[PDB]
Symmetry: D2
Subunit: 385 residues, 4 copies
Amino acid sequence: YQPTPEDRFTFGLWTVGWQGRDPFGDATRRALDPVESVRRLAELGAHGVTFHDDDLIPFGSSDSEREEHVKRFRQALDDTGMKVPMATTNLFTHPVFKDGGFTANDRDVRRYALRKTIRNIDLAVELGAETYVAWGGREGAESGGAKDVRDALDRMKEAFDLLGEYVTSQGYDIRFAIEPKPNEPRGDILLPTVGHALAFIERLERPELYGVNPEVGHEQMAGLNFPHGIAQALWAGKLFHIDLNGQNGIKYDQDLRFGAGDLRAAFWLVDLLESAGYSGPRHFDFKPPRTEDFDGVWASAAGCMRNYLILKERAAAFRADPEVQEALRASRLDELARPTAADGLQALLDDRSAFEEFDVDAAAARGMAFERLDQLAMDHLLGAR
Amino acid sequence: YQPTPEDRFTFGLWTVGWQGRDPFGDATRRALDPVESVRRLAELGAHGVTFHDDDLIPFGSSDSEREEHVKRFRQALDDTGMKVPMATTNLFTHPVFKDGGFTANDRDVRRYALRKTIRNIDLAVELGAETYVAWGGREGAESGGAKDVRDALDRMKEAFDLLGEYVTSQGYDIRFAIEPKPNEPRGDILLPTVGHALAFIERLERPELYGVNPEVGHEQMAGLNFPHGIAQALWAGKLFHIDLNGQNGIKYDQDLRFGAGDLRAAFWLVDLLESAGYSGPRHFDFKPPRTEDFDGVWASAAGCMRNYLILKERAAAFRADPEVQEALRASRLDELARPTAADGLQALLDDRSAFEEFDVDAAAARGMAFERLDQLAMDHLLGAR
Amino acid sequence: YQPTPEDRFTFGLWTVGWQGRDPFGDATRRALDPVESVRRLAELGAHGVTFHDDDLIPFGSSDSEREEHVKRFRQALDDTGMKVPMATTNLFTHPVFKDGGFTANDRDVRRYALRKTIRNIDLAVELGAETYVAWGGREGAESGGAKDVRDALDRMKEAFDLLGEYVTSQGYDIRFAIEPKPNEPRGDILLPTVGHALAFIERLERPELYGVNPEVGHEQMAGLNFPHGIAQALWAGKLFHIDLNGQNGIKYDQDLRFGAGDLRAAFWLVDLLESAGYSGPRHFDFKPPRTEDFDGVWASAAGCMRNYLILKERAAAFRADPEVQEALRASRLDELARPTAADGLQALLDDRSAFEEFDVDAAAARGMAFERLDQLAMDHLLGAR
Amino acid sequence: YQPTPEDRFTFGLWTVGWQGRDPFGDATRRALDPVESVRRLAELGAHGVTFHDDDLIPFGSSDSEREEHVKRFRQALDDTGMKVPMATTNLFTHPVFKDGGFTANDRDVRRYALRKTIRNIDLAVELGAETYVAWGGREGAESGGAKDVRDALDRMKEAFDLLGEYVTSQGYDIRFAIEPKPNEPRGDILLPTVGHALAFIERLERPELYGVNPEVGHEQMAGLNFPHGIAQALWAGKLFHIDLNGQNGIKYDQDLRFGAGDLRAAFWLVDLLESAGYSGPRHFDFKPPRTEDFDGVWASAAGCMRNYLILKERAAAFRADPEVQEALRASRLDELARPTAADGLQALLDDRSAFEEFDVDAAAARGMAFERLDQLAMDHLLGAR
Ligand SMILES: [Mg+2]
Ligand SMILES: [Mg+2]
Ligand SMILES: [Mg+2]
Ligand SMILES: [Mg+2]
Ligand SMILES: [Mg+2]
Ligand SMILES: [Mg+2]
Ligand SMILES: [Mg+2]
Ligand SMILES: [Mg+2]
């Protein structure tokens, strides 16, 4: 199960470069030169890297250091063939963003957040990114009175509309993807789930420029079914990007490598992405645990891609299995895909078989045969099939 | 804290009428005649009742029993002045709905679900309901392969569009509200949160006919901030109805009386509903615990309204407190309400105070004063103020 | 992966016999004659059945019906070779237990609960059960004032001590196992986790007569690591019995078939049970989903045993893998098993290599190599190894 | 509601001294001199401070800097009258503890952890601490194979037994308290709940030297009822210490000030502590949110004590209310405190009123009147009474 750049696996600089500082511990690893990470990730079979502006250009760099850093990075991209499909802004690390970026109560911080973002959009376009991700990790509150949510949504809409105006006025061909997270580092974060972000996009001035970048661990921190949420995003035509990792239930954001955490959900996710023809990057946003040295970092990063490829195999085997296709018909997955009432309202109303002469007890008695279907999915996942 | 019909408190027949059957226990209470519940609820200060078709008309009733039941109910409404602002369909109790109603895999069940619903819409209009609620409690799955979610969303859209066609073709003045629930009785339920339902409505043929009916306990079963979700629904203009109860964290749907469960959240919810001018019914969907006899049932139902009125008082006191308004300005809630960039994109770009000459360290050093504001909210809630 | 009676797989009568009534739905299946379940389970490879008194003898049966029911059951056991390793009392279904059995506030109910239990202990001994399970499903509260927990623990200790006196005075060779559950059907249940039950047993008069019967789904309803809890029970010498099923995170008690839910946890559990030499019954407490007809019921029950056997295989392969044993040494699992200070306190104090001359920075720099070890566990689980 | 030193309110140096570094953000506050915190906390009405060795003495200090730091601290304690009732060891910040202290896989780290602890025990005794707290925050695992839990419990028992030997051999009058936490910073932490720690203590060589130090937010991170767990610890005679803060459900450890989070639970906790006569320190382990400047830090710390005192008032009012005492008798809290069977086993067996002639239907029909009792508890909490 060896990854190729055609698998579109991408990594953030901040993932393998995480020094292992957590709320209760100091770094267990020295910092990684982005040039060294680009080269190590290319050797592992990755297709591309992503970056926050602050990952690449240390905060407060002069314009001459800034261009020196870009030029070094650009050399590493050119030496390796690595792409940069996605860029994002760090609006969460610096103390100035402690109440958020786009929805900070302080207006001058909101304007600074927009300028910091716009600067990096120019740079992202320059580096060829086609998706610009926005993770409002500091947008939210620990207490109810700290944030009027309707005002914050106004400010959030205003920020995203202005970003959309700037993109179309520059004639840039780049789209935005909102990354939801229900909590941490804020007590509650605005647009907490895929659903909340999808609803929000429909109120923007140019909705067609915005989609979602859902993350496995984030929806699972709310106990939600991450495959279900992805299906709805696809149904809406709004899955612009996706973040893969693992999470062991409702607790702090663990950012385990993909496939760790809820293994059955990872299987159903890959089944959905592959069967829907999702063609975006397969992005890993994970943290090698701080127990690990650099050898463990690359091992964890390899395991990300490996577990995707294994699950991709098992899902395809499951869908191609004639006994599964038989069981799918046994549970009437075929009838689920048919229109309830293509004959239209009036025909439905006059159809006495739909109500007056419907045998309710016969229909109730029919088994759905879901457990046999699920055990076949299990057998396939486990390679007992 | 005595409720009046002007408080628009409403109860489902199924709430006070719950016999106390749970997954592990038999009924602890005899069944309630709906006529007796209408009369008891009117004596408690309720404004109205709601019903599932099956609450009012026993399943499979002849057309003559059906009209006898309506006529008895109509007499109780006329004798008490109770209104019926909202009606809904039971698409979950009968075994025939075990895989759902609108998204059942079986097409004939889907058509039956639509006819069962349409019949009750006629009856709801007759009884004067202005909101028709849809809770897809059986729509979903315990296993990943049982339901193609994109197909189910198609079938769900199709059902709701047809309902919208039937309403507009009949010239009915009634709107629909989708009630989300993340799980139980299904392992995962479709449209699991307020966000997911809001996004879904934007894809219907006549979006203006559909809103949400969020329920406290349901969003909290996903660990979400229920006040935040309500704010987004209001921001969208889609809060058509609301269900009030209590819930002690992420576990089974407890349907505790309102104010039980997360007390601080109940306070912030009432603060939001009152300050936004929400004018719909204050509907209680709760279950008097099965430890209780009928005296405990009415006691629990009284406590629902009482806790709303107490919290309504404390929220208003909080918002009217000049020291709170001062603290709100101290945490820049006023600046949050101002446009980030009413001067427009180009002016923002040329504004060197927004970036080139922005003192990031000065802005970072400013405290948000959120903890003092929250302790004032606490003092008010507790009547220590 | 075919089960044999030597695998010690056991099922409750109430598991396959669940009619599919849930909080929101009526039965979807007719009731099962216990004699028919005993015969069907024997054909599936089960080793034994368990029962609540009320599963076997309908509540309130005359002494002549009671013995007729036992005699019919005894015939089915004799015709099939099925054993009854475990029996338990239903102290939760009848409305009289709505506030509990052993810790009901009403004393006459507590005495009735003890007599109901003692009667069934006699019957369990007669049928040869060696473990008597107690699941205090109604012991607890929805509200804080309803139950003084210290008093309830007194009443719980008193009940269990008296049960222990009755057993030793009758010269019965039977032991008790407490089954913890954190919630549902009560808002919070007493002795909510394995830990709470283990602590409680140490205060009983004859602690040696009592152990725990942990259940997968129950500890996971608290987000706990079920393998970890089982290890502690084993460490204490108190794992008398175990209940296997599946659960998808913190929500209502799903009682999915074993292997569904958290698949990686099921793998680590089987690894622990097998490597510790657990020799008790492998008991399945699960509910075939109500979507299923009787064919789906037996399919689900077969899947229980199958998933255990598959996981048992993969765990053994993992532990026997020399590259795993190498990786285990690489992460110092061997050093974890050695005494920290077998040289004793004074030697440790005088050992300057333990502190004064300990190279803290060298030790910190060592990687734990946990991620490589976990990916090997993953590969084995997935049959990619 | 002004605190006095007789209220026994204590704070960790690390609480008010938290610089606001979280997983996603840099410090928002400069470091606090412990001498300045001791003085500020004394002005707020605190009774005492607690410390990790590393809070007080910077890691790796010479013996001359070490005594200079103690001497400065000792001067601040002497100038203010502040006590040090509890001390603890930092076995979690330094990278060397990344796999734990007492249960690190590496033996030399385990010995170093014991020496680091023993050194601070001497210092704690010198400063007069009577409780030594152990929070095994790094003891546990992110993956199943990384830690054999039975071995780790052996190593944990060994460490605590040796600590007990050292204490009794030195003739120190100090006791140990284990602080449980279910997760974070490890994926799962050993001894995850109060129950797990209580069970563990019963296997130590000198159990009488060890109790628990439970923390509000920690048990709530597992969805458990923190008042219930405290009652069991009291019942066991093992509540040696307690940590107070707030937590909004199952998510990352928020360390909100006490009274924030689950307000009703905080009320029931104070009711229990006061009615049981708990006489230990009321210790706050919380973090002023990083949105706050130093003014917000002291405001948050004041709010801790204030919310305890308010709740203490409301609980006492509730218990002294004759209508509550009446309602308590109505729900048979009095009968719960009586022995089920003080007449003994044989008398119970011969008592036909306990079974043969017990009217089960009469007893079932009795209401528990729990909802009226809970609404009275609510009214008292809210000051609507
Ligand atoms: Mg994450
Ligand atoms: Mg991400
Ligand atoms: Mg509900
Ligand atoms: Mg509802
Ligand atoms: Mg269960
Ligand atoms: Mg069980
Ligand atoms: Mg904490
Ligand atoms: Mg603590």
